[PDB]
Design a protein around this ligand. Structure first.
Ligand SMILES: CN(C)[C@@H]1C(O)=C(C(N)=O)C(=O)[C@@]2(O)C(O)=C3C(=O)c4c(O)cccc4[C@@](C)(O)[C@H]3C[C@@H]12
Lengths: 206, 205
């Protein structure tokens, strides 16, 4: 409930993003995240025990902007879940293009963050999160089955992986070669292309 | 050879070992050299720097599929889409059965940072992806020229959609393998992809 410590936590997060982004997550110490932030070594430790905790705080911020539509899509009480899933994807893509903060954490996540046995928790955290995310899209896809928006004999599980794979590879393609996906201009196409596969692909049924 | 040609294959092997253990960012050539039992100078005779080693591991992934790739990319092929099916199935098989291929993909996706202290890695990957992208395009185009796919079909985007999907499937399997019976369901996983390209209006113009 104090405020200096809420200010200081929010500045460690900013510095970390800028640091991890220049030097990468591998060779960046917490001492480093200190000098850049203006703060003190001790303060980073009060706030974060280790760098894997910090990285986790970063990955976690990405789910905040989307919580609403995510929760709506998966509630069995939603009238239009495919509807919420389509708007979620439009928002994910839009936020990625407009918001430099999101583009950078994604860049840290995809191109600047090694899984080395020396730092085992980076990978575990990441596994957990993809399983989480996985959980969600499944409940959601199965809801669009009941309500007759997706084919009735769909395999939610596999369909979820298909879609996740598709969204993940596309975000990554765009971070590597933005000038090859007019992702802002065509966002509707890219999102719908993914959904297409889910509703029509015969190999996703059963 | 005189001074070994093989020394090369031995440096590449120690590079995979070091890279897989400590990652690309913090492996030095002295690490690689001690791992291979040679000196830094022996490394310098085959490679100018670390980005050259990474490059050579990356470029080693392409050999196996070589002929099925050219086959798809050739106009004179009777069955371009079937050649892409054969290729995807091999990509998935080799990845699941060959520890060497699994380890290098794992280096590439999860143990290789792009940082401006070396920008060559990011650049090498970029051209690598455009190269491959260009191949998919010409592949998708033939399948259209012979009515294996829908008509006048927007290739460029279906290409990107293809690569995105395969790429993210691989990465998904490297992260959580016991959640994609990749080996066992290879047929379904490949075709889900191919179904996208033929049955998706959004990929039509
Ligand atoms: C080791 N792994 C198996 C291969 C690889 O080294 C890749 C890489 N970027 O290093 C892939 O992206 C690789 O995983 C990959 O994504 C490949 C493809 O996407 C395709 C697609 O989609 C269609 C036709 C041909 C290919 C391909 C030959 O380029 C595939 C090569 C794949």
């Amino acid at each position: 409930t104090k405020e200096e410590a809420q200010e200081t936590r929010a500045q460690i997060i900013e510095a970390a993003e800028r640091a991890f982004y220049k030097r990468g997550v591998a060779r960046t110490t917490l001492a480093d995240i200190a000098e850049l932030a203006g703060v003190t070594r001790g303060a980073i430790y009060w706030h974060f025990n280790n760098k894997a905790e910090l990285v986790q705080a970063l990955l976690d911020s990405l789910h905040e902007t989307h919580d609403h539509l995510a929760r709506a899509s998966e509630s069995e009480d939603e009238v239009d879940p495919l509807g919420c899933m389509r708007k979620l994807l439009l928002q994910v893509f839009n936020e990625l293009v407009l918001d430099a903060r999101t583009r950078r954490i994604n860049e840290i996540l995809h191109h600047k963050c090694e899984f080395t046995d020396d730092m085992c928790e980076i990978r575990q955290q990441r596994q957990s999160a993809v399983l989480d995310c996985h959980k969600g899209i499944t409940l959601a896809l199965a809801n669009a089955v009941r309500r007759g928006q997706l084919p009735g004999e769909l395999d939610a599980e596999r369909a979820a992986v298909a879609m996740f794979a598709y969204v993940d590879g596309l975000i990554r393609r765009w971070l590597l070669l933005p000038d090859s996906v007019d992702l802002l201009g065509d966002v509707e196409k890219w999102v719908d292309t993914g959904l297409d596969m889910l509703r029509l692909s015969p190999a996703l049924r059963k």
